[PDB]
Design an enzyme around this catalytic site. Structure first.
Site, PDB file in Angstrom:
ATOM      1  N   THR A   1       0.898  -1.421   0.017  1.00  0.00           N
ATOM      2  CA  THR A   1      -0.108  -0.143  -0.138  1.00  0.00           C
ATOM      3  C   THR A   1       1.041   1.492   0.001  1.00  0.00           C
ATOM      4  O   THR A   1       1.861   1.152   0.442  1.00  0.00           O
ATOM      5  CB  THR A   1      -0.919   0.003   1.225  1.00  0.00           C
ATOM      6  OG1 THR A   1      -1.674  -1.222   1.014  1.00  0.00           O
ATOM      7  CG2 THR A   1      -1.961   1.169   1.214  1.00  0.00           C
TER       8      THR A   1
ATOM      9  N   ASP B   1      -3.315   4.766  -2.954  1.00  0.00           N
ATOM     10  CA  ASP B   1      -3.330   3.942  -4.319  1.00  0.00           C
ATOM     11  C   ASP B   1      -4.731   3.309  -3.876  1.00  0.00           C
ATOM     12  O   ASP B   1      -5.449   3.239  -3.373  1.00  0.00           O
ATOM     13  CB  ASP B   1      -2.106   3.315  -4.549  1.00  0.00           C
ATOM     14  CG  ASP B   1      -1.875   1.907  -3.728  1.00  0.00           C
ATOM     15  OD1 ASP B   1      -1.895   2.196  -2.250  1.00  0.00           O
ATOM     16  OD2 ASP B   1      -1.827   0.873  -4.151  1.00  0.00           O
TER      17      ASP B   1
ATOM     18  N   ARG C   1      -4.526  -0.575  -4.769  1.00  0.00           N
ATOM     19  CA  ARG C   1      -4.074  -2.190  -4.793  1.00  0.00           C
ATOM     20  C   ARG C   1      -4.115  -2.731  -3.587  1.00  0.00           C
ATOM     21  O   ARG C   1      -3.170  -2.409  -2.673  1.00  0.00           O
ATOM     22  CB  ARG C   1      -2.643  -2.087  -5.791  1.00  0.00           C
ATOM     23  CG  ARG C   1      -2.219  -3.525  -5.665  1.00  0.00           C
ATOM     24  CD  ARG C   1      -0.860  -3.538  -6.126  1.00  0.00           C
ATOM     25  NE  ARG C   1      -0.906  -3.887  -7.765  1.00  0.00           N
ATOM     26  CZ  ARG C   1       0.036  -3.951  -8.595  1.00  0.00           C
ATOM     27  NH1 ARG C   1       1.212  -3.753  -8.095  1.00  0.00           N
ATOM     28  NH2 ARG C   1      -0.186  -4.286  -9.882  1.00  0.00           N
TER      29      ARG C   1
ATOM     30  N   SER D   1       3.862   0.320   2.415  1.00  0.00           N
ATOM     31  CA  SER D   1       5.247  -0.345   1.711  1.00  0.00           C
ATOM     32  C   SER D   1       5.757   0.747   0.707  1.00  0.00           C
ATOM     33  O   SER D   1       6.963   0.576   0.345  1.00  0.00           O
ATOM     34  CB  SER D   1       4.927  -1.604   0.815  1.00  0.00           C
ATOM     35  OG  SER D   1       3.911  -1.510  -0.070  1.00  0.00           O
TER      36      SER D   1
ATOM     37  N   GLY E   1      -1.603  -1.434   6.007  1.00  0.00           N
ATOM     38  CA  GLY E   1      -1.454  -2.499   7.022  1.00  0.00           C
ATOM     39  C   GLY E   1      -2.230  -3.678   6.545  1.00  0.00           C
ATOM     40  O   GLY E   1      -2.653  -3.983   5.288  1.00  0.00           O
TER      41      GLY E   1
ATOM     42  N   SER F   1       2.182  -1.506  -3.970  1.00  0.00           N
ATOM     43  CA  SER F   1       1.237  -0.401  -4.495  1.00  0.00           C
ATOM     44  C   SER F   1       1.076  -0.460  -5.974  1.00  0.00           C
ATOM     45  O   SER F   1       1.951  -0.859  -6.821  1.00  0.00           O
ATOM     46  CB  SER F   1       1.561   0.903  -4.112  1.00  0.00           C
ATOM     47  OG  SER F   1       2.339   0.647  -2.967  1.00  0.00           O
TER      48      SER F   1
ATOM     49  N   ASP G   1       6.994   0.873  -6.168  1.00  0.00           N
ATOM     50  CA  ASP G   1       6.583  -0.134  -5.153  1.00  0.00           C
ATOM     51  C   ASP G   1       5.867  -1.328  -5.667  1.00  0.00           C
ATOM     52  O   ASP G   1       4.666  -0.911  -6.191  1.00  0.00           O
ATOM     53  CB  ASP G   1       6.204   0.432  -3.755  1.00  0.00           C
ATOM     54  CG  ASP G   1       5.716  -0.515  -2.895  1.00  0.00           C
ATOM     55  OD1 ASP G   1       6.601  -1.616  -2.717  1.00  0.00           O
ATOM     56  OD2 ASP G   1       4.634  -0.451  -2.246  1.00  0.00           O
TER      57      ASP G   1
ATOM     58  N   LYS H   1      -8.901   3.049  -0.050  1.00  0.00           N
ATOM     59  CA  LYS H   1      -8.390   3.220   1.307  1.00  0.00           C
ATOM     60  C   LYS H   1      -8.558   4.242   2.063  1.00  0.00           C
ATOM     61  O   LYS H   1      -8.046   4.377   3.046  1.00  0.00           O
ATOM     62  CB  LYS H   1      -6.738   2.968   0.948  1.00  0.00           C
ATOM     63  CG  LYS H   1      -6.560   1.687   0.036  1.00  0.00           C
ATOM     64  CD  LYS H   1      -5.175   1.560  -0.264  1.00  0.00           C
ATOM     65  CE  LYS H   1      -4.739   0.313  -1.078  1.00  0.00           C
ATOM     66  NZ  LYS H   1      -3.608   0.233  -1.649  1.00  0.00           N
TER      67      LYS H   1
END
Ligand SMILES: *[C@@H](CS(C)(=O)=O)[C@H](Cc1ccc(CN)cc1)NC(=O)[C@H](CC(C)C)NC(=O)[C@H](CC(C)C)NC(=O)c1cnccn1
Ligand SMILES: [Cl-]
Ligand SMILES: [Mg+2]
Ligand SMILES: [Mg+2]
Lengths: 240, 244, 250, 231, 226, 204, 241, 243
Positions: free
Chosen positions: E1, E17, E19, E129, E47, E169, E166, E33
């Site tokens: 994330t 994001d 995903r 992340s 998380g 994400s 990343d 999110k």
């Protein structure tokens, strides 16, 4: 929790709630127990104020506690169910831990103990119920008939009645039942049980229920027509 | 302490009666009459609403007839709020049985459970009993069609036809007079409405006053259908039987 | 330091009456008149802001309360009992419904939960019944608009229109004559204001009258944009100005 | 009258009638006497029989090696309170390696009896206790009433006709307090004191009950032929 | 994330994001999110996805009831305090990492909340992340008194940095703008830089291609009635 | 040892034009041992369909639980529950066991009776919702199903085309997984008719 | 007649125990008054020290609940202190849980909801007190909110409590009928206190010394009580005009 | 009527008759007093010698709380002990958490709230004691008196029990004649006098004087009993004043 002492002693040494519970028993429909030589019979009154009843599904007055022991009663119907449930539980619990079904005396003692507990527990009233508990011990051919009452006393009876006009049917049994020679057969025992109810019931055969219990878990309830034959034979002999 | 104010709801009278049960039954005797009639091919439940006002929204209203599951319904006489407590419990007992055994609860088992709950309130806890009498109408694959009643004492019995609430004495005489064992649902519908029509304290029996329901094993392909009658459908059946 | 009242304070008298419920209904009778009228495209609930002193700020005392975005409540009887019932009603809407199903409860079920709370005060140990009758107006997607009355007993009935409290007998007769099944919301508001004038002695204006509606969705009152499905609360409390506007056309 | 239904109710004159009725059960109880010197402390108790076939009800109970009491009133209540004392005496020994002070024992009894007088449902204790003991500050005698009042005394008596013994001790005060290092003479003075409360009946061998504790004397009870010496 | 939040002239902005991943695979390509808490208070969650969703929903329910009780607009500090006290209680076993932002009568606020119950105050923050990719962009470009137009650009850039660089994400960019004296505007799918390219072939099968043993109608209705 | 892959099995759900499809394999195993070839993983509560993969005891338990809850819902609400509301109920119910979860992969499928809108959803074992437009996969061959669905799927398929696509997605995925297969069932769901088809597949 | 002993309904629909708790309110024979300025809320109360043995510094019916909230009580001091301690606890617990200072009106509502519970639950008696809460709330500004034994509560422009409340109420009513505003249009709290004292003197018809009054003042971010010398400075200013 | 039969019931007046009946028990008890001095407090009490058999100096009525607070009371003696036991628990848990010994006003409320709690329910009886207590804290000396209602105030001088009117009159003179204040050793003497003067109301039986004191200079702020020569000096002073 509700802790109030409902069953208590009065100045004259009486516990009125226990005695008033007996008055609820006096109101209840008549129940009678007669033990023969190789059987016990449990007779019960069904008041005929209630017609349009469904007799298939209506709670029957005699209840099986195990396959070899029965319980009938007089008094508050709703109260009787609680005792019957507890007894049936204890019957299976005894089989599970002792690997043997209850004796009739053991089962009676348990039910009597429950009735007693409610006469000196906080927040509860006594059971408005007296019971007749009958059957045969495992691998035994001696008949058993016990009586309990709201106070929690219990005792064994050659024959006994409880409920409304039980004074009259006890009068009848006291003169008609001989201890030295009890009803030798099933027929004789059933006849004496029907005869005794006919003193109080004052109507034909719909108002009488009969259950015969024999040794080795042989319990059967008689039908209307089977009972009606006993009623017919009794009054035909009486016309003389 | 507190003892001073305790009514002592769970005691015997000198005569061996339960005061509060008796007084609750007196409460129920003023409630709108409910009638249950059992036939060979179904059960009828008929009941009289108590609060005639023109402004009462009748189509969304439910004071008398409640559904317990797909097979079992009840008619209520007494305090509606008390009945709804018991009804939600009975609905749960049904589903617990269904979850455990994967079979619909037999009618007598559900009735006994409720009746046992009512009994508890008369013997312990020091609370007032439930001021409710039920007529249970139901079906199962053991006994088929069954009518029961329970009252605040927790006593229950089975019936072919029965009334609770107001004028039960007059109502039970009339049912006892016209009921027969080979009777059918359509005949029982008529009997139920005729009985209410004679026993009602009102000047006339109308659709806006009634709740009406049938349980028939006359659904498609041998299933059982519960029908809670809509206001228009009660009005139709009143014209059909010739009361209005 | 014990709660020893584990026994019912409400019991059956010989005649079959539940005294405390009857007396709670008597307390409701002494209370100020409130009413509810159901229209085709809305419901209106109304009552008099009976001010205990002119120094008091009657705006702070909300007799008409939002329970959910689509459900509102008004009362007659004991105000403090009402206030706490509103608190519990709001919470029970979340705990026994929204946190399970991810949506607000329908009118009838929230009413059922309030009814339950009031019934329990009529049977539980050591409590008196609630001394209020509630009128709960609401909307939900599958039942549409609805109006319910809830009594001290825990009994509830759905109404097209009704009144409770002081001048309820006279007010219900007035509503019977005026009500029909083709009323628009504005017509019901008009009838509500007419009916409520009869039971009011003193001043009659937007400051001494509290009035709310369950009507159309208010996306302007939502506070946010960006979710097409959330269209805003149907409950709306009419302003002091909005009431006085309709009183000129009276 | 109206204010005597339970212990939680004050009367209009500020009285707790249930406590005063519990006090009355002591007066109906059989007489018992307590007295002490600087070295020893003595209990003397007139035990009561139901009839001539029955035993004489035991009046004296040991609490520890250095402390005990005599009772007058409801004997089951004395059992409860003595059992509580035993445990407190025992707690002091086990945890602090310390013999419980007689004054502190009184304080514990006072506070145990008090809780029963202020709360609903409970009843006061229906018994009076005379606690003797020898601790780190010498001989002690306590009088416990079930109102909660505990009183340190040279001597006293409780029970039926106790006023006769109590007046005697009040006169004898200056004599018996000086009876140091002589257990028998101190017991004599107690036996003579309890004789002032007798009417019709006299002190027989299974009637009398005496206990003593002192400097080099554990709390010991004397009954039967062990008290024939003092008749 | 990859989540981020930052402040600008008269407001706060959140970004995220879209995903959601289980292990190495992409379970969701369009998940939200940014969680609702109150009309002008929002929460970005990274998380454990269920933990982050559930915790915000609970506090959001309690914030609503608190608002009703007090007859006031809810405050971001109320949400912050309730979230941290709940997360602390569970000792990180509720693995929710949150950026909470909003507007209330006090002003505009921005806070981060970690799974163990620690909270931070910041002018720009990022979690998940992709936080290092996002923070690199925020550190290079953030300044005081950003305009709303610059703030949305910087927020979306910070999220994009996560999306590209990343693996955790991906997909689209969600943004929420909370400005003082205005309704909060929630902008789901604000950027859509990862639309799938058209496929080379259509894999729609000829009918009857699949072998079938049995057929039946399912009764979904209540009671078929007479 | 890993509970989600003791018994095995798969569920896949897809949306089409005015329809949804949900499908499952029929295997129940004890790791390598096949035990039953009649273990269906798709249930229904009114018009809402629920597929459940994972530990078989929990599959059965949750079915019995959601039947219970939806029955009470219906008695109180006086209407059948909808897919969107049921999804929330499933999530709620799984997350209340957050720290002792049911080891399952549920999949909701159905058509909202009022809006007519096709709806599918999936969950992890603790109730996080994946509300996909295109498809939901679940089970021991979820990777395989993702690969099949992602290439085979196209939006707005007619009911009888959607059947072919979802079937071929299931079948070819199950044949690349040891713990799935042994038969398969496919429900094609429309607003007021539902067709159930058993598929012929290799029995290894 | 046990309907008069506990909190259950009489046949009239009345709770006699609530009504008798209200009569206990005036047992102190003390009159209180609260008014609002622009930036402040002033509460004044009569102080009566009948015994010479009493330490007059410990005789108070005004309580500092939080920094922002003050509370004056009309009623017997044990119940006043019961209510004060609870309010303090509630105001601290609120701040801890929700991260901001408990508003005046919210506390009043909370204490009222508690008071309601004593009217419905039988084992708890009502407190025989009327609680007048005062603050300068950060959202609402100057605030007066009053709770009683019935569990009723409401906001006030100004208020008065005690045996002679009707005289003080009508005096205040008449002043706000003239000014046609909800508050005392005055910058400094010092002058608002002077107003409060003056209008109590007019209503009650009695003069005051420094030891006959007790004053509480709420400003932004603090509530505080005035000393005898602070009050004396107030009384001097009143007399000099 | 019937409003006086249950605790926590308001009469039509707005009175709790059971609490007023507890006051009658207090009025029935022996005389106890408190005197606030310059840097401390002095407590004294009348102990009725019912009989010669009572041991002198042994049946101690004044009780210490923590190390710095003294408590004396008139009425039902056991009730007074139960309250002090509570006070000790309060003072202990205060010190446990906050390190510093409990301040006297803080301590005063801990008793005041507890006594008040016993007027809230019919399941408990009100306390049958007025309690005079106090000591020295960081802010200086404090004297309090606490009634069955839970009502308490700070005092310059306090008195309760059967001789309270007599004592109060004597305390009022001390307040008028010493505005600058009374020293600790002076207060001990005056306390002895006041108990002796208040003994005319309990004149049938003779009595035993008991005095205690906290004083910053004389006891280091700690509670101590007045013993030996200082007690005898106070008794002599008191005996001289009555004659
Ligand atoms: C990104 C978090 S990260 C990898 O730390 O940066 C993302 C945050 C997120 C996703 C979706 C929502 C929607 N409410 C909110 C927030 N979290 C995930 O992708 C997590 C990452 C896990 C915890 C490593 N994924 C999950 O929680 C998934 C469920 C999703 C797909 C709905 N579950 C698991 O990964 C999982 C694994 N083992 C057991 C149970 N669940
Ligand atoms: Cl509250
Ligand atoms: Mg395979
Ligand atoms: Mg009360």
């Amino acid at each position: 929790g509700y802790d109030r002492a409902l069953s208590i002693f009065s100045p004259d040494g009486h516990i009125f709630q226990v005695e008033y519970a007996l008055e609820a028993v006096k109101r209840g429909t008549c129940a009678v127990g007669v033990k023969g030589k190789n059987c016990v019979v449990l007779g019960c009154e069904r008041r005929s104020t209630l017609k349009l009843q469904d007799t298939r599904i209506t709670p029957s007055k005699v209840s099986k506690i195990d396959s070899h022991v029965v319980l009938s009663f007089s008094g508050l119907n709703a109260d009787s169910r609680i005792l019957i449930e507890k007894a049936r539980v204890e019957a299976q619990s005894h089989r599970l831990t002792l690997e043997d079904p209850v004796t009739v005396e053991y089962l009676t003692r348990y039910v009597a103990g429950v009735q007693q507990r409610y006469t000196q527990s906080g927040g509860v009233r006594p059971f408005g119920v007296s019971t007749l508990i009958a059957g045969f011990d495992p691998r035994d051919d001696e008949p058993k008939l016990y009586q309990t009452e709201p106070s929690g006393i219990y005792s064994s009876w050659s024959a006994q009645t409880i409920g409304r006009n039980s004074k009259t049917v006890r009068e009848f049994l006291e003169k008609n039942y001989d201890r030295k020679e009890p009803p030798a057969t099933v027929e004789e025992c059933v006849k004496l049980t029907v005869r005794s109810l006919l003193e109080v019931v004052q109507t034909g055969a719909k108002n009488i229920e009969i259950t015969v219990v024999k040794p080795d878990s042989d319990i059967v309830a008689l039908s209307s027509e089977e009972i009606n034959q006993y009623v017919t034979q009794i009054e035909q002999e009486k016309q003389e | 302490g507190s003892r001073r104010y305790d009514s002592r709801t769970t005691i015997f009278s000198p005569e061996g009666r339960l005061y509060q049960v008796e007084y609750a039954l007196e409460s129920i005797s003023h409630a709108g009459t409910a009638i249950g009639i059992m036939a060979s091919d179904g059960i009828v439940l008929a009941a009289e609403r108590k609060v005639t006002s023109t402004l009462l929204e009748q189509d969304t209203s439910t004071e008398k007839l409640y559904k317990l599951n797909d097979k079992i319904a009840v008619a209520v006489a007494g305090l509606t709020a008390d009945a709804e407590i018991l009804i939600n419990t009975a609905r749960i007992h049904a589903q617990n049985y269904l979850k455990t055994y994967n079979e619909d609860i037999p009618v007598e088992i559900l009735v006994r459970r409720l009746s046992d709950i009512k009994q508890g309130y008369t013997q312990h806890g020091g609370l007032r009993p439930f001021g409710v009498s039920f007529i249970y109408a139901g079906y199962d694959d053991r006994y088929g069609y069954q009518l029961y009643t329970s009252n605040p004492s927790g006593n229950y019995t089975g019936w072919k036809a029965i009334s609770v609430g107001a004028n039960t004495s007059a109502a039970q005489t009339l049912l006892q007079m016209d009921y027969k064992d080979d009777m059918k649902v359509d005949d029982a519908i008529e009997l139920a409405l005729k009985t209410l029509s004679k026993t009602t304290d009102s000047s006339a029996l109308t659709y806006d006053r009634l709740e009406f329901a049938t349980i028939r094993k006359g659904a498609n392909d041998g299933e059982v259908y519960q029908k809670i009658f809509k206001p228009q459908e009660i009005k139709d059946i009143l014209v059909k039987t010739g009361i209005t | 330091m014990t709660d020893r009242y584990s026994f019912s304070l409400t019991t059956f008298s010989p005649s079959g009456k539940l005294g405390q419920i009857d007396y709670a209904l008597t307390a409701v009778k002494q209370g100020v008149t409130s009413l509810g009228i159901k229209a085709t495209n809305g419901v209106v609930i109304a009552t008099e802001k009976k001010s205990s002193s002119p120094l008091a700020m009657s705006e702070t005392l909300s007799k008409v309360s939002l329970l959910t975005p689509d459900i509102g409540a008004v009362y007659s009887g004991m105000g403090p009992d009402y206030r706490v019932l509103v608190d519990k009603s709001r919470k029970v809407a979340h705990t026994s419904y929204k946190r399970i199903y991810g949506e607000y409860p329908p009118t009838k079920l929230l009413v059922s939960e309030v009814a339950k709370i009031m019934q329990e005060a009529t049977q539980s140990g050591g409590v008196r019944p609630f001394g209020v009758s509630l009128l709960i107006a609401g909307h939900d997607e599958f039942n549409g608009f609805s109006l319910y009355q809830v009594d001290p007993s825990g009994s509830y009935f759905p109404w097209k229109a009704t009144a409770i409290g002081k001048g309820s007998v006279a007010a219900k007769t007035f509503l019977e004559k005026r009500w029909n099944d083709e009323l628009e919301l504005e017509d019901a508001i008009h009838i509500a204001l007419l009916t409520l004038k009869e039971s009011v002695e003193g001043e009659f204006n937007g400051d001494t009258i509290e009035l709310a509606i369950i009507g159309d969705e208010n996306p302007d009152l939502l506070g946010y944009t960006g979710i097409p499905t959330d269209k805003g609360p149907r409950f709306r409390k009419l302003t002091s100005q909005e009431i006085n506007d309709r009183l000129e056309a009276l | 009258n109206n204010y005597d239904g339970d212990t939680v109710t004050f009367s209009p004159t500020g009285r707790l009638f249930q406590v005063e009725y519990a006090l009355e059960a002591i007066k109906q109880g059989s007489v018992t006497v307590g007295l002490r010197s600087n070295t020893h402390a003595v209990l003397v108790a007139l035990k009561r029989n139901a009839d001539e076939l029955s035993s004489y009800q035991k009046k004296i109970i040991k609490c520890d090696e250095h402390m005990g009491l005599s009772l007058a009133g409801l004997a089951p209540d004395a059992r409860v309170l003595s059992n509580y004392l035993r445990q407190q005496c025992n707690y002091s020994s086990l945890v602090f390696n310390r013999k419980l002070a007689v004054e502190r024992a009184g304080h514990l009894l006072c506070d145990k009896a008090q809780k029963n007088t202020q709360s609903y449902g409970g009843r006061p204790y229906g018994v009076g206790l005379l606690i003797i003991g020898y601790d780190k500050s010498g001989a002690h005698l306590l009088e416990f009433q079930p109102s909660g009042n505990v009183t340190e005394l040279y001597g006293t008596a409780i029970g039926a006709r106790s006023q006769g013994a109590k007046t005697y001790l009040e006169r004898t005060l200056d004599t018996f307090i000086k009876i140091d290092g002589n257990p028998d003479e101190l017991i004599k003075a107690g036996v003579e004191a309890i004789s002032q409360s007798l009417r019709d009946e006299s002190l027989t061998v299974d009637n009398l009950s005496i206990a003593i504790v002192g400097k080099d004397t554990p709390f010991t009870i004397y009954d039967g032929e062990a008290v024939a010496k003092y008749i | 994330t990859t989540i981020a939040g930052l402040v600008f002239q008269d407001g706060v902005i959140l970004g995220a994001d879209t995903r959601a991943t289980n292990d190495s695979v992409v379970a969701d390509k369009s998940c939200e999110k940014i969680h609702f808490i109150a009309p002008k208070i929002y929460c970005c969650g990274a998380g454990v996805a269920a933990d982050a969703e559930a915790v915000t929903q609970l506090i959001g329910s309690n914030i609503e009831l608190h608002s009703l009780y007090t007859s006031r607009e809810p405050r971001v500090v109320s949400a912050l305090q309730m979230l941290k006290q709940h997360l602390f209680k569970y000792q990180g076993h509720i693995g929710a990492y949150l950026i909470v932002a909003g507007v209330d009568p006090t002003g505009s606020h921005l806070f981060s909340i970690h799974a163990h119950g620690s909270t931070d105050v910041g002018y720009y923050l990022s979690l998940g992340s992709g936080s290092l990719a996002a923070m690199a962009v925020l550190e290079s470009h953030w300044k005081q008194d950003l305009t709303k137009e610059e703030a949305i650009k910087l927020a979306s850039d910070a999220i994009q940095a996560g999306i590209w660089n990343d693996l955790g994400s991906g997909s689209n960019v969600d943004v929420c703008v909370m400005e003082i004296g205005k309704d909060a505007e929630y902008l789901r799918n604000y950027l859509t830089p990862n639309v799938r390219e058209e496929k080379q072939k259509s894999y729609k099968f000829p009918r009857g291609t699949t072998a079938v043993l049995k057929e039946s109608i399912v009764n979904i209705c209540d009671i078929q009635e007479e | 040892s890993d509970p989600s892959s003791i018994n095995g099995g798969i569920v896949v759900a897809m949306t089409g034009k005015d329809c949804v499809a949900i499908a499952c394999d029929l295997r129940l195993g004890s790791q390598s041992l096949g035990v039953s070839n009649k273990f269906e993983k798709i249930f229904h509560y009114g018009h809402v369909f629920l597929g459940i993969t994972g530990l078989a005891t929990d599959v059965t338990t949750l079915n019995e639980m959601f039947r219970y809850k939806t029955n009470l819902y219906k008695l109180k609400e006086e209407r059948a529950i909808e897919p969107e509301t049921f999804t929330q109920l499933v999530s709620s119910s799984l997350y209340e066991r957050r720290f002792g979860p049911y080891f399952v992969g549920p999949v909701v499928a159905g058509i909202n009776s009022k809006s007519g809108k096709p709806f599918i959803a999936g969950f992890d074992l603790i109730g996080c919702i994946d509300e996909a437009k295109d498809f939901i996969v679940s089970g021991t061959a979820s990777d395989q199903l993702f690969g099949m669905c992602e290439s085979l799927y196209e939006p707005n398929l007619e009911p009888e085309d959607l059947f072919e696509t979802i079937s071929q997605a299931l079948l070819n995925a199950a044949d690349r997984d040891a713990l799935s297969g042994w038969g398969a069932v496919v429900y094609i769901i429309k607003k007021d008719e539902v067709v159930k088809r058993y598929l012929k597949m290799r029995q290894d | 007649g046990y309907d008069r002993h506990i909190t259950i309904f009489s046949p009239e629909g009345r709770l006699y125990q609530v009504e008798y708790a209200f009569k206990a309110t005036n047992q102190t024979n003390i009159n209180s008054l609260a008014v609002r300025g622009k930036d402040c809320t002033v509460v004044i109360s009569q102080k009566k020290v009948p015994d010479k043995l009493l330490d007059p510094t410990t005789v108070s019916y005004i309580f500092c609940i939080s920094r922002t909230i003050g509370m004056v009580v009309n009623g017997p001091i044990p119940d006043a202190r019961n209510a004060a301690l609870r309010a303090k606890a509630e105001a601290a617990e609120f701040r801890y849980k929700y991260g901001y200072d408990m508003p005046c009106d919210v506390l009043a509502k909370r204490m009222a909801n508690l008071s309601q519970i004593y009217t419905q639950r039988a084992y708890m008696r009502p407190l025989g007190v009327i609680l007048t809460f005062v603050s300068v709330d950060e959202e609402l500004g100057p605030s007066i909110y009053k709770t009683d034994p019935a569990g009723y509560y409401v906001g006030y422009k100004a208020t008065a409590t005690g045996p002679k409340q009707q005289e003080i109420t009508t005096n205040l009513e008449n002043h706000f009928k003239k000014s046609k505003i909800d508050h005392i249009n005055e910058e400094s709290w010092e002058k608002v206190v002077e107003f409060a004292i003056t209008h109590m003197i007019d209503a009650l018809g009695t003069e005051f010394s420094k030891n006959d009054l007790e004053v509480g003042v709420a400003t932004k971010d603090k509530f505080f009580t005035l000393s005898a010398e602070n009050i004396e400075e107030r009384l001097v200013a009143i007399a000099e005009q | 009527t019937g409003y006086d039969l249950s605790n926590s019931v308001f009469s039509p007046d707005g009175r709790n008759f059971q609490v007023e009946y507890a006051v009658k028990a207090v009025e029935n008890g022996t005389t106890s007093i408190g005197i606030k001095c310059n840097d401390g407090v002095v407590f004294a009490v009348e102990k009725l010698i019912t009989s010669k058999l009572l041991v002198p100096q042994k049946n101690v009525k004044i009780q210490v709380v923590d190390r710095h607070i003294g408590c004396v009371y008139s009425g039902l003696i056991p009730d007074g002990r139960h309250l002090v036991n509570r006070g000790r628990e309060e003072a202990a848990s205060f010190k446990k958490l906050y390190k510093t010994p409990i301040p006297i006003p803080a301590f005063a409320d801990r008793l005041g709230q507890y006594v008040q709690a016993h007027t809230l329910y019919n399941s408990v009886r009100p306390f049958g004691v007025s309690t005079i207590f106090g000591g020295v804290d960081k802010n200086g000396a404090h004297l309090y008196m606490l009634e069955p209602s839970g009502s308490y105030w700070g005092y310059k001088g306090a008195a309760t029990g059967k001789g309270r009117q007599s004592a109060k009159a004597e305390l009022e003179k001390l307040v008028d004649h010493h505005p600058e204040g009374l020293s600790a050793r002076e207060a001990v003497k005056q306390a002895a006098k006041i108990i002796y003067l208040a003994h005319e109301d309990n004149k049938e039986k003779d009595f035993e004087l008991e005095i205690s004191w906290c004083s910053l200079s004389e006891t280091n702020g700690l509670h101590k009993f007045v013993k030996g020569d200082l007690l005898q000096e106070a008794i002599d002073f008191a005996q001289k004043e009555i004659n």
